[PDB]
């Protein structure tokens, strides 16, 4: 049915319908405008009128302008054809390559999996990255808080993750830019092309891109995480995959929700956040989980407002996180890449019960010896000298050449299997390689290459 605009106040538009009203969350299509303008129903105001949030600018709108009820929430292209493409919150291509020709479309508002669909199986999603797999492993269906600003190799880590998960497991990735800076959205796209995770010439792309740029209205930036989620849900629920979902930034998801709540006249809660802060977060996060079909695992870049970890935004987000990856400038300036702080990064599945007994012991041994090395930095005996040289070789063996940084450097990038990582750090703790030099452990893959780097350079 066709309604009529009765109010326009910024990105808030009221629409009157003569017959049956569109349910809350339904997408409405504004008639007679150059590009596509979607309005999402937020409230039934009474007297046949609904209040909506606009997905694009509202300038030029006239009272009485015709509006079409689509019959459903925002529906976007889902399938293999999303891989390598960039779409917006309403599923339109924004890479100037034409339609995204999927054989299915899906609603972006979808209930989180039910209790009966839950998997109790705790499984490590092997990334093939030594720092991560050993000390702060990712859990299938889990959420990982990615910390650190820029210049700490964030994007290269992201691209290698996409590369590795597709290579090792056979699962695809989805990148949701929530409040993406248009300049940085362009950079990321072309960096992904260079690394090979996006291929413009064939169907081998490993990521689907979903962008909600900063200059878009609150409604668009609030819903774009859901759009990305919906693309990921196809690969899990229709193709049985272990999918990766990147959300850059989770705070900007919260911020956009606060702005939408403000625009709808809802009274702000503590610190100015929306009263729906926790439910806004929950209805989104709970869709990221392990089910019987597969799993969506999510890496979420975290901004901490005012560096206050007790701020409602990070505090509410932390409730949903299972692990952290802390990218550090101090680790970067030491030349160790990835620049992951091996002591600050933690994981809930670092447990002798979930991961192996062999996994837990070695990782606890690596943690202890790195902390003890920092203790001995202030100040040695034969036992202390042995723990110092062991730890310095451990610091270097945590570094890794990436497959994504192969054309830039020329150095062969490495994907290291889990058991190869565990036994590598196990052979250093035992002092089996304290017979061999130190810098042979810097920027290598499996331990067999560190032995060969000592065999060649002797």
């Amino acid at each position: 049915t066709t309604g009529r605009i009765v109010a326009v106040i910024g990105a808030v538009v009221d629409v009157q319908f003569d017959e049956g009203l569109p349910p809350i969350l339904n997408a409405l299509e504004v008639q007679g405008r150059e590009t596509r303008l979607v309005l999402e129903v937020a409230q039934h105001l009474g007297e046949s009128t609904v209040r909506t949030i606009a997905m694009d600018g509202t300038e030029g709108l006239v009272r009485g302008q015709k509006v079409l009820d689509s019959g459903a929430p925002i529906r976007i292209p889902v399938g293999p054809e999303t891989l390598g493409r960039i779409m917006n919150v309403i599923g339109e291509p924004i890479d100037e390559r034409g339609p995204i020709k999927t054989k299915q479309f899906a609603a972006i508002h979808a209930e989180a999996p039910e209790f009966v669909e839950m998997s109790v199986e705790q499984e490590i999603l092997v990334t093939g990255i030594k720092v991560v797999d050993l000390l702060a492993p990712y859990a299938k269906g889990g959420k990982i808080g990615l910390f650190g600003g820029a210049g700490v190799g964030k994007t290269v880590l992201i691209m290698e993750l996409i590369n590795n998960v597709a290579k090792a497991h056979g699962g695809y990735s989805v990148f949701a830019g929530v409040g993406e800076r248009t300049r940085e959205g362009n950079d990321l796209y072309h960096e992904m092309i260079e690394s090979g995770v996006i291929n413009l010439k064939d169907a081998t792309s490993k990521v689907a891109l979903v962008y909600g740029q900063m200059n878009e209205p609150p409604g668009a930036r609030a819903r774009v995480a859901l759009t990305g989620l919906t693309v990921a849900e196809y690969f899990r629920d229709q193709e049985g995959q272990d999918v990766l979902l990147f959300i850059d930034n989770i705070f900007r998801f919260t911020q956009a929700g606060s702005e939408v709540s403000a625009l709808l006249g809802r009274i702000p809660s503590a610190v100015g956040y929306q009263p729906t802060l926790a439910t806004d977060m929950g209805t989104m996060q709970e869709r990221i989980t392990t089910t019987k079909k597969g799993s969506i695992t999510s890496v979420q870049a975290i901004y901490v407002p005012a560096d206050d970890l007790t701020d409602p935004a990070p505090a509410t987000t932390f409730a949903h996180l299972d692990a952290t990856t802390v990218l550090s400038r101090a680790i970067a300036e030491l030349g160790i890449y990835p620049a992951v702080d091996p002591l600050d990064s933690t994981s809930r599945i670092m447990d002798p019960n979930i991961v192996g007994s062999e996994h837990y012991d070695v990782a606890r041994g690596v943690q202890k010896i790195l902390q003890d090395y920092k203790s001995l930095q202030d100040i040695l005996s034969e036992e202390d000298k042995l723990t110092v040289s062991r730890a310095r070789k451990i610091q270097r063996f945590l570094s890794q050449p990436f497959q994504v940084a192969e054309v830039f450097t020329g150095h062969l990038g490495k994907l290291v299997p889990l058991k190869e990582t565990i036994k590598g750090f196990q052979q250093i703790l035992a002092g089996e390689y304290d017979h061999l030099p130190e810098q042979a452990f810097y920027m290598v893959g499996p331990i067999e290459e560190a032995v060969a780097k000592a065999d060649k350079l002797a």
Partner: protein, 52 residues
């Protein structure tokens, strides 16, 4: 004897002082941030009350 004792005692006292400073930094940072949040919340409640 005196200087060996004095240098040890200074090392000791300064270690403890630096620890006490650390715990005070944490305590003060927490007070700062509770106050930071409360100021924002209070201002907003006054604005809302005036508008309603």
């Amino acid at each position: 004897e005196s200087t060996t004792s004095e240098q040890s005692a200074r090392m000791t006292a300064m270690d403890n002082a630096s620890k006490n400073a650390s715990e005070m930094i944490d305590k003060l940072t927490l007070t700062f941030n509770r106050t930071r949040q409360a100021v924002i919340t209070k201002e907003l409640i006054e604005i809302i009350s005036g508008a309603a």
